[PDB]
Amino acid sequence: MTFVALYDYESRTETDLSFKKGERLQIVNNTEGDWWLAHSLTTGRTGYIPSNYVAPS
Amino acid sequence: MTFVALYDYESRTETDLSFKKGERLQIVNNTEGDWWLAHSLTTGRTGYIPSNYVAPS
């Protein structure tokens, strides 16, 4: 469950995690699931979604 | 591909996408990759990260 950062990353929102190249990171088990960038065909809006909230169609 | 929302979701940040149960959503291809919740063992900070920025160790 352990990963290493390949690049520096600066946070853009109150919820992302800033890190430097080299840091050791562990994935946190989440009820939300992985987040994906999605576009709503229903509303035209676009943004990140919790993948546990959706199902293939 | 195309997914259907199973639940309503209200946005928490400027970057997430609010949706209602029933909406049809499409995955937007992204250089960041899927986002994961991660804990830095190096810094103790915790937040979402772009999975393309890390590698298993």
UniProtKB/Swiss-Prot annotation, chains A, B:
Expressed to high levels, and with a high degree of kinase activity, in certain fully differentiated cells such as neurons, platelets and macrophages. Isoform 1 is widely expressed. Isoform 2 is expressed only in the muscle. Residues 2-57 form the SH3 domain. The phosphorylated form is termed pp60c-src. S-nitrosylation is important for activation of its kinase activity. It is found in: Cell membrane; Mitochondrion inner membrane; Endosome membrane; Nucleus. Belongs to the protein kinase superfamily. Tyr protein kinase family. SRC subfamily. Non-receptor protein tyrosine kinase which is activated following engagement of many different classes of cellular receptors including immune response receptors, integrins and other adhesion receptors, receptor protein tyrosine kinases, G protein-coupled receptors as well as cytokine receptors. Participates in signaling pathways that control a diverse spectrum of biological activities including gene transcription, immune response, cell adhesion, cell cycle progression, apoptosis, migration, and transformation. Forms a complex with polyoma virus middle T antigen. Interacts with AFAP-110. Interacts with GJA1 and PXN. This is Proto-oncogene tyrosine-protein kinase Src. It comes from Gallus gallus. The gene is SRC.
